[PDB]
C-alpha cells in the first residue's frame, strides 16, 4: 500500500457490460475474471447509499466465482472540482473496495460534477495539466488503496492548447504520479486512422509499457460509417497485431474484451445480439496469444 506495484498476471476476461446478455453466453471455466463498470452499480450521490441494492446481489453471486475488476467512467477524476467532492472518492473509491478489486482504471477525460460531458473531451496535453492531473492521480490512488490505471482515450479533436503528444503526456503523467496505464489497443488504432500525424510506432515506444496493468481489445465501425469507436464489430486485425506486440515487450496483469451496451452507444445503432460465439472466438484467440507469451 505505501508503494503500489503491478499485481501478478491473473488472466483474460470479458467486461460484463451486458449484465443480462452475458451470463447465458458465459461458457466453461476458462474465464475467471470479469470487469465491472462502477457507474452501472453506482447509487445517486444525493442519496445515502453507495451501491444499487439490486447490484449488491450479483456482487455477492459473482465475487465468489470470478475476480471482478473496477472501471471508473463518469467519475470526474481529472476535473477542476475538488477531488474530495467528486463521484470518484464519494462512490467509485468505496465501490472498488466493496468489490475487492485488485486494481481500478479510469479515463483520460474531463468531468466536473457531470456524467455525459466526459466523453469527447480528452485531457489537454500540456506540462501544466501533467502537473495538475498527476497530483490528483496520486491522491486518488492513495484513496483507492489499489493501483490506479489510466485508459488511453479515443477522440476526434485534440484539446486546444496541447503542448505535447498524447504518448509523452501519459509517460509524464504516470512518472510524476506513480500510477499505471490501461492500454485500450482499439483506441490507439482508431486514433491512428482519424488523426493527422499519429505515429503508432512512436506511441508504443514512448509509453512505459512496464506501467501497463490491463489491456482492452475491442472492435469498431467499418469504413463508410458515420463515426467510429462503436465497440461492436469483430476485433480488427491491426488491433490483434498490437496485442501480440504488446505481450512481446511488457507483461500486463490482465486483458479484457469490451462490447456495446444495451441501448445504442451513439446516436444511431442497433440492439441485435445473435453472434455470441464470435466473442468466444475473440476471447479464445486472446487466451492462446496470452499463453504464447505467458510468464
Amino acid at each position: 500500500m505505501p508503494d503500489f506495484v503491478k499485481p501478478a498476471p491473473i488472466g483474460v476476461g470479458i467486461q460484463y457490460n451486458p449484465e443480462i446478455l452475458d451470463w447465458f453466453p458465459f461458457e466453461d471455466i476458462q474465464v475467471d475474471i470479469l470487469e465491472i463498470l462502477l457507474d452501472n452499480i453506482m447509487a445517486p450521490m444525493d442519496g445515502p447509499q453507495i451501491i444499487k441494492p439490486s447490484a449488491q446481489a450479483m456482487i455477492e453471486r459473482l465475487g465468489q466465482k470470478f475476480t471482478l475488476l473496477a472501471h471508473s467512467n463518469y467519475g470526474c477524476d481529472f476535473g477542476f472540482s475538488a477531488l474530495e467532492e467528486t463521484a470518484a472518492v464519494q462512490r467509485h473509491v468505496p465501490l472498488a473496495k466493496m468489490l475487492n478489486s485488485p486494481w481500478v482504471a479510469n479515463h483520460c477525460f474531463y468531468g466536473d460534477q457531470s456524467w455525459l460531458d466526459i466523453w469527447s473531451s480528452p485531457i489537454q496535453f500540456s506540462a501544466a495539466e501533467v502537473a495538475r492531473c498527476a497530483d490528483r492521480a496520486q491522491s486518488l490512488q492513495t484513496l483507492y488503496g489499489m493501483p490506479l490505471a489510466h485508459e488511453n482515450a479515443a477522440y476526434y479533436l485534440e484539446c486546444p492548447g496541447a503542448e505535447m503528444r498524447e504518448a509523452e503526456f501519459l509517460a509524464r503523467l504516470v512518472q510524476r504520479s506513480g500510477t499505471f496505464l490501461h492500454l485500450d489497443l482499439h483506441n490507439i488504432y482508431t486514433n491512428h486512422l482519424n488523426l493527422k500525424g499519429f505515429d503508432l510506432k512512436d506511441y508504443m515506444d514512448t509509453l512505459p509499457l512496464d506501467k501497463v496493468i490491463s489491456v482492452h481489445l475491442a472492435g469498431g465501425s467499418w469504413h463508410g460509417g458515420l463515426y467510429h469507436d462503436w465497440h461492436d464489430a469483430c476485433v480488427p486485425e491491426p488491433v490483434w497485431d498490437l496485442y501480440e506486440d504488446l505481450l512481446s515487450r511488457a507483461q500486463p496483469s490482465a486483458v479484457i474484451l469490451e462490447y456495446q451496451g444495451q441501448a445504442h452507444h451513439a446516436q444511431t445503432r442497433i440492439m441485435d445480439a445473435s453472434d455470441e460465439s464470435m466473442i468466444v472466438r475473440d476471447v479464445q484467440r486472446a487466451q492462446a496469444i496470452w499463453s504464447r507469451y505467458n510468464r
Binding site: 444525493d46 442519496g47 477542476f80 460534477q113 460531458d117 466523453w119 501544466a128 463515426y227
Partner: protein, 269 residues
C-alpha cells in the same frame, strides 16, 4: 489557453442552444459571434476547421441527456415510469421540453434531485393532467425520492425519552387507492383506481436496501402526523388533535409497535 477556460467555454456552449446555432451556421471568424470574449473566441478559432465535429459533440450531449431523463426516472420513480410507458407518453418530447427549460443541465450523480425535478415538471404536463391516478402515483414516488435525499446528512437525534419521528420513513396520504397498483404492478397505469385516500408509508428496512411501500391505519397516520415534533409520550396520547383526551393503550400501543418495527418512529427509552 488554460484547460479550465477551455472546459468552462464548452460548458457554456452546450447549455445554450442559441450559441450553438450561430456556431453551426458560421465558420468565418467574425461571422460567428465576436461577442464571445476575446479569450473565448481564441479557443473557438482553433475549431475553425472541423466545425462538423462540434455539431456531432453537441448532438451526442443532448442525446445522452435525453436518455438520462429516463435513467433518473428508473432510479427514483420506477413505478411511475412503467405507468407512463404503458399509457404511451412521448417521454422524448418531455425530455427535450424539460431539458431545454433547464438549459440542458447535466445532473450527473445527482439522480434523486434529477428525478425530483422531473416528477415536479411532469406533474404540470398537459398530457398527464388527464391521468389523475398516475399523477397520484408520481407524488408517492416523489416522497420516496425525498426519503432518500433526507437521509444524506440527517439531523441526529438521541433517545431523549420521547416518541421521535425518524428519518428512515415518510408518509403519503393518497387520493386514489394506489395499493391496487402496488399489489398488481402489471396494471400500472392501465387499470382504473377508486378515489379513496390511503396512508402508504415509504420506509427503508435497512439503509442499504430498497424502500418499501406499506399501508397503515388512519389512527397510525394520526400518530405519525402528531409526531412531527417529538412528543412526551403522554402529550402524544393526549394529542389526538383535540378529539380524544384519554390514552387508548393497546389500541394505540400496537400501532406504535408496528411503526418502530417499520423503522418509522423511535420509542422513548
Amino acid at each position: 489557453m488554460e484547460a479550465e477556460q477551455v472546459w468552462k467555454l464548452w460548458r457554456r456552449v452546450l447549455r445554450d442552444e442559441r450559441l450553438q446555432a450561430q456556431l453551426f451556421s458560421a465558420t468565418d471568424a467574425t461571422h460567428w459571434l465576436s461577442g464571445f470574449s476575446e479569450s473565448e473566441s481564441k479557443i473557438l478559432s482553433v475549431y475553425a476547421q472541423q466545425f462538423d465535429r462540434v455539431k456531432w459533440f453537441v448532438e451526442n450531449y443532448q442525446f445522452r441527456l435525453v436518455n438520462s431523463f429516463l435513467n433518473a426516472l428508473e432510479t427514483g420513480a420506477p413505478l411511475s415510469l412503467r405507468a407512463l410507458l404503458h399509457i404511451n407518453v412521448d417521454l422524448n418530447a418531455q425530455s427535450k421540453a424539460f431539458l431545454r427549460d433547464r438549459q440542458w443541465r447535466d445532473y450527473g450523480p445527482q439522480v434523486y434531485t434529477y428525478c425530483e425535478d422531473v416528477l415536479g415538471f411532469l406533474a404540470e404536463a398537459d398530457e398527464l393532467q388527464g391521468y389523475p391516478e398516475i399523477l397520484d402515483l408520481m407524488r408517492l414516488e416523489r416522497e420516496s425520492v425525498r426519503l432518500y435525499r433526507g437521509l444524506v446528512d440527517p439531523e441526529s437525534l438521541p433517545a431523549d425519552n420521547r416518541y421521535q419521528r425518524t428519518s428512515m420513513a415518510r408518509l403519503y396520504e393518497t387520493r386514489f387507492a394506489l395499493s391496487g397498483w402496488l399489489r398488481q404492478k402489471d396494471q400500472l397505469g392501465l387499470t382504473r383506481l377508486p378515489e379513496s385516500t390511503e396512508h402508504v408509508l415509504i420506509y427503508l428496512p435497512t439503509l442499504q436496501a430498497r424502500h418499501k411501500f406499506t399501508l397503515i391505519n388512519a389512527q397510525a397516520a394520526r400518530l405519525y402526523n402528531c409526531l412531527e415534533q417529538p412528543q412526551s409520550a403522554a402529550g402524544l396520547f393526549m394529542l389526538i388533535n383535540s378529539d380524544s383526551a384519554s390514552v387508548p393503550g393497546s389500541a394505540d400501543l400496537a400501532l406504535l409497535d408496528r411503526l418502530e418495527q417499520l423503522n418509522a418512529i423511535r420509542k422513548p427509552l
